[PDB]
Amino acid sequence: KRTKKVGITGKYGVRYGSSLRRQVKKLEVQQHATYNCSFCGKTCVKRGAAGVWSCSSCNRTIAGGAYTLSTAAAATVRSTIRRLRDM
Amino acid sequence: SQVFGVARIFASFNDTFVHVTDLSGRETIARVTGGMKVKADRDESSPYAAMLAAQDVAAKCKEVGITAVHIKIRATGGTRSKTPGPGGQAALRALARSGLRIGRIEDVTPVPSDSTRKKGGRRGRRL
C-alpha cells in the first residue's frame, strides 16, 4: 500500500482539493477497471471512450454509461421494460 | 320502479358532505354540505348543518326524480382520524325523515393498508 487514501487520484497530486479528488477517484476507479463481459464470460479490460466498452478477448462493443458498464438507471430500466414486455 | 342514487355522506370532523350520485359514480345529482347551509364556520360538522344539508339534497333529489339511495359513508380516512363525524349519523336521520328511501348502507372509509405517515410528527399535537 503506497497511498493511505489518495489511491489512484494521486496522479493529481496536491491539486483540485480533497473533495474533487474524492469524487473523481470513485469514477476513475470505476472507469479504469475491468467489467465482466456479459457474453464472452471473461473479465479484461476495458472501457474505451465514454459509454463504449469493450472487447476482452473477443471484440464486441457495448454502449454503457460513462464511467461504468451499466449505470443503475440502465438496470432499473431493463426491469421496467422486463415488466412492461410481459404485459 | 325504484330509481337508485348513492348518497355518499362524507362526515369528517369540522365538515359534512352529502353527495348523491348515479351508480356508475360519474353523473352527480347534488353536493350539499354543512358549511354551505350554515354561515358560522364552526358549525359545519354539527348535526343541525348535516340535517339541513341532507334535506336540501332530498329536495334536489325529488325534483330530478330519485326514489331511493345507497347510503355510503366516508369518515376522513387514512392520514386523518378514520373515525365517523358528528353529522354523519345526523345526516342518516335526515335522509330517512325526508322520505328519501334507503338500501344497502356502507362506510367505505379508506382505512389504509399500511398508511403513509399521519399529521403531527412523533410527539403529536401537543395542546
Binding site: M87 | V3, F4, D22, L23, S24, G25, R26, E27, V64, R104, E106, D107, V108, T109, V111
Partner: protein
C-alpha cells in the same frame, strides 16, 4: 348561466348474464352534441354494485361486482364484470384476533387476453374442542396453503375463457376446492375470493360482449 339539468339524458344499465337479472338500474348523461358524442362518453363507466342486487338473495349480500360499460346499443348500454369486491365492513368482521388469516394473490392470463389477478381470504379455524385460545397456523402450513390456493386459482382461472370463471366464482364453488385440499394441511374457515382485479383487455372486440345478452 347555463344549467344542464334540463339538458340531460337517462339511459339504462344492462347486467350480463350469469346473474339473475340482466338490468341493474339507471344512470344518466348529456345528449350526443357535435364533437362530444353520447356513445363514446358512456363506454368506460364502471357500475360497482352489490351481488344481492343482481341475484336477489342475501347469501350474496357479502359481495360487490364492478361492471364496465363497453357498448351502447339503442339507449340500452351493456356492461362487463370488470372486477369483484367485498365492501369494507364485511371482511373486517371476519378478521378476528387470536387466529391466523391467509391471503393468496394469483396473476393469470385467461384463454382471452385478460390478465386476471385473484385474491383469497382464508382464516384459520378455531377448532372444535379448542382450549389453546389461539388457532395459529405454523408459517410452514400457511406457506403450503398459500401454494395450494394458488395451485387452485391457476387451474380454475386460466381455463374456461373468463366468462365461465365468473359462473364458477358467483356461487362459491372454487371456495370449497380450496377448503377441501387444505384440510390435509390445516382446517380453515370462511374462504372467499374477496377481490378479483383486471389488468389487460384486447381491442374491445365490440361484438364479443353481446354473447351475454339474449
Amino acid at each position: 348561466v347555463v344549467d344542464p339539468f334540463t339538458r340531460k339524458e337517462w339511459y339504462d344499465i344492462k347486467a350480463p348474464s350469469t346473474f339473475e337479472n340482466r338490468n341493474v338500474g339507471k344512470t344518466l348523461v348529456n345528449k350526443s352534441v357535435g364533437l362530444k358524442n353520447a356513445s363514446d362518453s358512456l363506454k368506460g363507466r364502471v357500475v360497482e354494485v352489490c351481488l344481492a342486487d343482481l341475484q336477489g338473495s342475501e347469501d350474496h349480500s357479502f359481495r360487490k361486482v364492478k361492471l364496465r360499460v363497453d357498448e351502447v346499443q339503442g339507449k340500452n348500454l351493456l356492461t362487463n364484470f370488470h372486477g369483484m369486491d367485498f365492501t369494507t365492513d364485511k371482511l373486517r368482521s371476519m378478521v378476528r384476533k387470536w387466529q391466523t388469516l391467509i391471503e393468496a394473490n394469483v396473476t393469470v392470463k385467461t384463454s382471452d387476453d385478460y390478465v386476471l389477478r385473484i385474491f383469497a381470504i382464508a382464516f384459520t379455524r378455531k377448532q372444535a374442542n379448542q382450549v389453546k385460545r389461539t388457532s395459529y397456523a405454523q408459517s410452514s402450513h400457511i406457506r403450503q396453503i398459500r401454494k395450494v390456493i394458488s395451485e387452485i386459482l391457476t387451474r380454475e382461472v386460466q381455463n374456461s375463457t373468463l366468462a365461465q370463471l365468473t359462473s364458477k366464482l358467483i356461487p362459491e364453488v372454487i371456495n370449497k376446492e380450496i377448503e377441501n385440499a387444505t384440510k390435509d394441511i390445516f382446517p380453515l374457515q370462511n374462504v372467499h375470493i374477496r377481490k378479483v382485479k383486471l389488468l389487460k383487455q384486447p381491442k374491445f372486440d365490440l361484438g364479443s360482449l353481446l354473447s351475454l345478452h339474449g
